[model samples]
Target: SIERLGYLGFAVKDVPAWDHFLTKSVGLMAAGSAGDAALYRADQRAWRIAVQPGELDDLAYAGLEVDDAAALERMADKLRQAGVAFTRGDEALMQQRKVMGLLCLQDPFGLPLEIYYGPAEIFHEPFLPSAPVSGFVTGDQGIGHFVRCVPDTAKAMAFYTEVLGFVLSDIIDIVPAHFLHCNGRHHTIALAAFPIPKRIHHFMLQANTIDDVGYAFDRLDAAGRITSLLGRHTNDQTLSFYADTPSPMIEVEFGWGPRTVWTVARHSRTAMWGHKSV
Candidate 1:
């Protein structure tokens, strides 16, 4: 079973653009780099986001965290029984991902997913965001959330909750969406019934304080990248806004104080107010 949303890999045509945008606008610290890939840190882990050069700007994959090597083995066995085809990662791939064990698979939406164990932590190398903020709400919450575009919400929901072990937190019919949780966070994975390809609508990173979201909003606003104005979600009650990333179609959300899964109302609009599209 997937424990949390661990990390995300992006394929970009311009590495420098991503580096500048993430560091300067999103308030993430540059953790490390390897060849064409760059890693960014929001908290204690070595990296939570990575960008690598590619022909198109899109999501390369999403990494899911598990407890340890044992849990990974159990998951592999479960996949085998379920008739899911997956490959065990080699030593080099494991080293590149900075994990003890790794497995690769694709979701129903044809999105690449990496399930990993034992992510390397860097407590000594402190995070320093370019923009002033109180730091991200990571740790047990596991690097915020990701929402993907799917062709069928019902089928996609079953694959995630029944097969992949995410519990059905709630469903939003404003556009046919389902929210699932693996931890205390309101929703770790959200499915939207949209036909568009490239596998994602947006990925979110939460800040420890609302002031952090406000400051990051200012940075994005100054850069002319804000896509959705500040608003609170009706489901999670996240006081957040969306901004276009350096990539072609990806959006990143920065928010503070999203309501927990136990506290959110079952039925509500996507947002209470103030999330108008630009």
Candidate 2:
């Protein structure tokens, strides 16, 4: 529930191309850049996500870290021996990555990503407009959502619900994005379309408050990140949308209202708004 911000991930056509897409177009600062992947951090917790080269669409291959290095090592050994393909470079590769103790692996869907015990942190003083700030939200609450395209929604859902331990918060069949939750947030991960399922749509990180949200608007405006259009989601009822981001990804709609599911609640069969990207 309160795990560190495990790295967000995706496969792109070209690492640098997608890196530009994420930074210039999307608007996230690079935690560190590399040939195989690029890391971005909106806040602390080391690197928020790392982008890698693969197919067209961006997919989430986030690495959920365990308690400590030993636990991670065990899990890595188990997964590796189980025949899961992983990425680990020699000293040359390590130098290229610019990170220590980091390794990469693929999911059941064949999506590759990194899992590192350590990374760099700059701790930039807030460029955000400061006022009556309520401080930042972290853990599962920090990240609002991430959209990862899936070839099979049902299979993916099963993998999350059964294998990975994510719960389905709600369903949006109208456009096809399924809201999922881990801990209590409305969605930590969302499963979208396939073939391009490896492509990442956009991931979110909640600011401290509405004032912070407004402050972010100013930052994005000054930085000139690509704006995909911003507004509120009628479904989750959060003020968000596709906007210019700093990474190769799309939007970084900052807001809140990730509710936990107590009883099994069905999703809306109809569309909440006019145009919803599936």
Candidate 3:
């Protein structure tokens, strides 16, 4: 019933810090604001990410896109059949979400999941990155990827695949992590069966060119902020590095040239090399 991964909403203690990190450091374009929250654009969509001031710095919600109202109703029906409770978004909530319509529900792990359709786009205000880069790899693949920690990886994976229709891309058997995909991009979401302080492990943004990743690495390296050094993953084969965001618990990964569903390989290693703590 779901089409692809949509935008992500974050509850942050310092909205300005997130704004600076995303725009200046990660090269995302600011897409205006909605009240106290800040919106950023990584692609043509009105916004790919939203950060709002809150008591805790955590993932506020995740939005999933469907084809239209019919698909949405079908999704709701599926939820009902599966005995999952959900509520339809009213006009005001829809306006805030910038979508035509939506259904809001919580996963078994108590994470907010929003399924919606028709995202507003502003062509006049084209995406202009603060840092140099070709652009982010979005569109059908949606906004890069996100990984979250769950006490039971099997249950979380089942919720995503059985309820949401995400296909299993592969598994990192070593860490016991499972990667799932809704589109061509390697993995839209991953589940880790381990205890973590934060709801999210990390989120990723893909660059169109390898040079963009290299340039960002040089910039971050000089600042002495590279959390995980440059590395190539065995599953997706994305050459990237991890860096800490304004929120200490959450990190943003910048990568390029990830293997798609057609080209992905089964691998036991998380990183081919590097990705080591320094």
Candidate 4:
């Protein structure tokens, strides 16, 4: 059921800052013009991440991959028959997403989500960083992870596990973060506990070159989009962390391997709070 986690979408306030962050700092290859809400990616499936303009805060919209275009249609019909609201545009409009078929929908908790397939491949060559980092080679392995803030973690977890068929790979009780997987790149998305209506805390994308994160930090600062100091998270062991410019609410994590989840090993505990923000 879980074909793949297609991509992560974030609505930002400062497009310029994000532009610098993604292209210069994170070093992800850009596919669209900088003036628009462009989609960008590493050498991976779909676009690794999408940036759009929005009101209030930046939110994460996780794209759940279906088997194919036909499957996407069936999903729409199923959701419609079940009385769920769906958002769709014409074929020409959908083509901008590069997906063959797509229907955006809100989940049980009112989070904007999408089910799409057939996104156009922007490049034949993988994004080879000019200053490369050795941990992860080119490909999907570099996209890393995404996490959402869910007050109803149980319900959210069930939706991903049941509807999309993602497996619950691990859990952390120190503020409670649940990791779910489909294709074994550790966790595609993580759900963390928060006291708000279901919302995105932040999402992560792996950057092979650690220096790229640093460069982006300066670019974000120069552009006036940097919100927090760049530092590592104790829980995730990630070196690059920053609050984005567009939507001030969430942070975008760009870093490396998150201590891979093992089938037989017990889930390890991380995070000992003294930190601020979700």
Model 2 lDDT, full chain set? 0.55
- Candidate 2, residues 142-243, lDDT tens digits: the string is 335677776778877765665445677676764577877666566677787744322566677665566656655555555565263345554565654355
Off by over 4 Å in 3: 262-266
Question: Candidate 1 on 1-278: residue-level lDDT in tens?
Answer: 88999899999988898999988888888987855689998888888999999986898989999998999999898788877789999998888888999999988768889999999999888878877888888887798888889888888887888778998778777776888999889899998876666578889999989889899999999999999999999888899999998876788999999878654245657888889998
Worst 10 contiguous positions by lDDT, candidate 2: 125-134
Higher-ranked by TM-score: 2 or 3:
3
Off by over 4 Å in 2: 1-5, 9-40, 49-61, 73-103, 115-136, 140-144, 194-198, 215-236, 244-250, 269-278
lDDT of each: 0.87, 0.55, 0.86, 0.62
Residue pairs clashing in model 3 are: none
Candidate 1 residue pairs in clash (backbone atoms < 3 Å) = none
RMSD (CA, Å), each prediction: 1.5, 5.4, 1.6, 4.5
**Best-performing candidate as measured by lDDT:** 1
Quote the lDDT for 221 in model 3. 74
